[PDB]
Each structure stands twice: as C-alpha cells, then as structure tokens.
C-alpha cells in the first residue's frame, strides 16, 4: 500500500525556483521522518534536508539551508521541498524517502533540469559506405544531432521496421544533444524498397523524415 | 562530514558470496552513525536494503547481510543472484548530517559473453556541407555490457571528439551503445583512414574507413 508517488519532472531557466510535492499513502503519516535527498548526475546521492511530521521541525545539510525549504502538508499528508535560486549544479533528480531505522521505501523521483536553449535536432542519414552486404544484411542509421530538449524519438519506417532497429543514447555536445538510431536489413530490402527514419522531437512540435539513399 | 569510501564497481556470479565494504574517515563506525544501506535497481529505482548496522525486511531477502567491521561497515550478499544487479548506497550519520557513500556499482553476469557487431559511419553529405563531419560507430549485442573506444585517424590516436556514451541495455539483455568523432570537413577532408576499434576485454575490434 506504502506509496510516494512523487512529482512530475521540472525544466527551468536560472534564477527560477521549483517546488516538489511527495505525496505518501501505504503508511502512517505521523510515525516517520521524510527526507529530501538530491542525486546528481555522476556525484550520486546527497542529503538535503528532512522534516519531522512527529514535531513539526524540518532538518538542513547547511550546504543547502539557502537553496530548498522542507514543508509538510499534513491535511494531504504530502511533504513539499521548495528550491530557490536555481543554477546549472542544481540540475538532478530529487528523492523524497521515509524514515524508520534506514531509508525504507523510496519516492519514484522527480527530475529538475535549469539551462539554456531549445532546439529540434538536425538530422543526418547514414548509409554504407559503398560496402554492400556480408549476411545479405545492411546497417543504415540516423543522425539526430544538436536538440534540445530530450527527449528524442526515433522509428524505423513508420514503426514498421521494428527489428533490427538500435536507438542510442544521446549525447551532450555543444551543450545540446546528440543521439542515434540503426536499422539492420536485408540487402534486398534496401535501396528497392525505402527506408526511412522518423525522428520525434517533443518540446518544438517536430517529426521530420530522413530518406536514405546510397551515396 | 566525512567522507564514505565505497567500492566503485564490482561484479560477481550466482552462486557466489560478495562482500561491499563502506569506509568512514572519521574513525569507528558505531551506532551514533546509524549505518543505513539502500538499493538503487537501474530505472534509477531506490530501495531501503539495511538498517541500524543490523535490521533486514521490509521484505529484503535473508541472503543479503550488513555488518560493521572495525573502520567501515561492509554488506555482505552470500548467494548472489543476478537480481540483486544494483547500485548499493551506504549513508553514515555524523550529526546533523547524512553521507552517503560514492555506491558500488554490482555486475551480477548472468548471460554469455557475447561481442561486439560495430558498423562505422562517416560523414553524411548534407552535414559536411554544415562544415562539421561526424564519424559513427555503432556497438551493439555485446555482453557483459563495458567497452572502451578508441579511435585513430590515419594511424593517428585521437584524444579528440570522441563522444562514447555508457552502454544501454537491449530487449535481448545484451548492451548497446556508440562512439562519435565530430571534427570539421576541412580535417575530414584532410585524411584518409578514420578507424574506430572497441574494447570489450582483452580484444580490440577495429573498425576503418578509407574515404579517400
Ligand atoms: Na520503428
Ligand atoms: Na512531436
Ligand atoms: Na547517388
Ligand atoms: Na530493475
Ligand atoms: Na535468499
């Protein structure tokens, strides 16, 4: 029954501020502690602070006393974390997890991204280089390069061409990101029949096309 | 306060007993620390594992064990299954203050070693009229899921560009992944070999291009 369904993900410019809501259900409100703690990209977890439903009395790492404010909503039973001034460093996914004698279950976690700009990608086919087929199968891919935001989508001729179909990791480049996407096939299949790469950018109301054609 | 050591990365097989250890650097890890472990299962899912340097379930299997060795506390997993690949987290208490250790980032292998089908992609045509060309190099079905890649152009090492990211795993279970070499036309049109060649354990696949 214990549930911390936690809020949905947050994108904002610096100087903004974001305030997470934890709701709980599963548990008794009153009997345990909740703690904020911030995992940041690589440097992992981090203690930010927790509130004491049990005296009402919130708990600050100093590092952070400035930056968030725990507060609790008792009437919903739902603990709130408040962070101001946001910057780049501030950027992660923050946790809300209960007390007892550890931190037993935990919140589903809630991302909060600070930054710059918007972009689609720019996308770029890949197409063997004048090679040909050595299973009778041939890789073509796409380049979904320099967007913002994430995230990217990627389908293989409309999502008819399901098997064979690799979707990569996107990368930060220029401070925008780059991704990835292969589709394996027959020899036969390509150029004959067409072959097409549907990428999905969500933040710019993008969904761009990229034919492959043989250099 | 101090700083909690934790082992990076550790790998093991079922059957088998592994031990994480979690350092503090003030001393002698007692109760007033209040040792606490959690799990994190890769969809960066968080799960309280341990608690009070002692107490176990909140359903948490008998085969995992804490303990408090001397200067550090340690998790013992004797049985090791392939579910309990993780990222395990200790947390020490120093007043007013809660530090949590770098995780141990636990490989349970569980599959066959599989290798490495890497394809090279070279720069498309409408790109390089943008003056940039961006070489890629897919990875894919490879088990266990940890490749180093690394590039030469005409022979030549590159510490440039190089974009790999972290291996992503597939429905198959086997991982997937690629290596970007971004440069402009002008380098690109300068070469003539572009060579991309992974690393999966002791054996480098190499994987070239000679586009003029
Ligand atoms: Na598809
Ligand atoms: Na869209
Ligand atoms: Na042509
Ligand atoms: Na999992
Ligand atoms: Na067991």
């Known amino acids: 029954e214990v549930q911390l369904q936690q809020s949905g993900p947050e994108l904002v410019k610096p100087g903004a501020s974001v305030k997470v809501s934890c709701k709980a259900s599963?548990?008794?409100?009153?009997?345990?502690?909740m703690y904020w703690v911030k995992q940041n990209h690589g440097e992992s977890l981090e203690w930010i602070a927790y509130?004491?439903?049990?005296?009402?009395?919130?708990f600050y790492n100093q590092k952070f006393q400035g930056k968030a404010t725990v507060t609790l909503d008792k009437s919903s039973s739902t603990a709130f974390m408040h962070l101001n001034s946001l910057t780049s460093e501030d950027s992660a996914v923050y946790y809300c997890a209960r007390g007892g004698g550890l931190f037993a279950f935990w919140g589903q976690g809630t991302l909060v991204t600070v930054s710059a700009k918007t972009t689609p990608p720019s996308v770029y086919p890949l197409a063997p280089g004048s090679a040909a087929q050595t299973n009778s199968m041939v890789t073509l891919g796409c380049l979904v390069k320099g967007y913002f935001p994430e995230p990217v989508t990627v389908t293989w001729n409309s999502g008819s061409l399901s098997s064979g179909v690799h979707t990569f990791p996107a990368v930060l480049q220029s401070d925008l990101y780059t991704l990835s996407s292969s589709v394996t096939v027959p020899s036969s299949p390509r150029p004959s029949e067409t072959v097409t790469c549907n990428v999905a950018h969500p933040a710019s109301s993008t969904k761009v096309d990229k034919k492959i054609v043989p250099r | 306060q101090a700083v909690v050591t934790q082992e990076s990365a550790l790998t093991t097989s079922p059957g088998e007993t592994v031990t994480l250890t979690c350092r503090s650097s003030?001393?002698?890890?007692?109760?007033?620390?209040?040792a606490n472990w959690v799990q994190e299962k890769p969809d960066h899912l968080f799960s309280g594992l341990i608690g009070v340097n002692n107490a176990r379930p909140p359903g948490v299997p008998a085969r995992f064990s804490g303990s408090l060795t001397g200067d550090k506390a340690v998790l013992t997993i004797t049985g090791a299954q392939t579910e309990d690949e993780a990222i395990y987290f200790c947390?020490?208490?120093?007043?007013?203050?809660?530090?949590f250790g770098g995780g141990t980032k636990l490989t349970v292998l569980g599959q066959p070693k599989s290798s490495p089908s890497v394809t090279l992609f070279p720069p498309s045509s409408e790109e390089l009229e943008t003056n940039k060309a961006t070489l890629v190099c897919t990875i894919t079905d490879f088990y266990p899921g940890v490749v180093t890649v690394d590039w030469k152009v005409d022979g030549t090492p590159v510490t440039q560009g190089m974009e790999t990211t972290q291996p992503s795993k597939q429905s198959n279970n086997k991982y997937m992944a690629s290596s970007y070499l971004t440069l402009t036309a002008r380098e690109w049109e300068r070469h003539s070999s572009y060579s991309c060649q992974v690393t999966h354990e002791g054996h480098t696949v190499e994987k070239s291009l000679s586009r003029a």
């Open positions: 003030t001393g002698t890890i007692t109760s007033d620390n209040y």
């Open positions: 599963g548990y008794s409100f009153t009997d345990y502690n």
């Open positions: 509130i004491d439903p049990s005296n009402g009395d919130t």
């Open positions: 947390a020490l208490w120093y007043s007013n203050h809660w530090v």
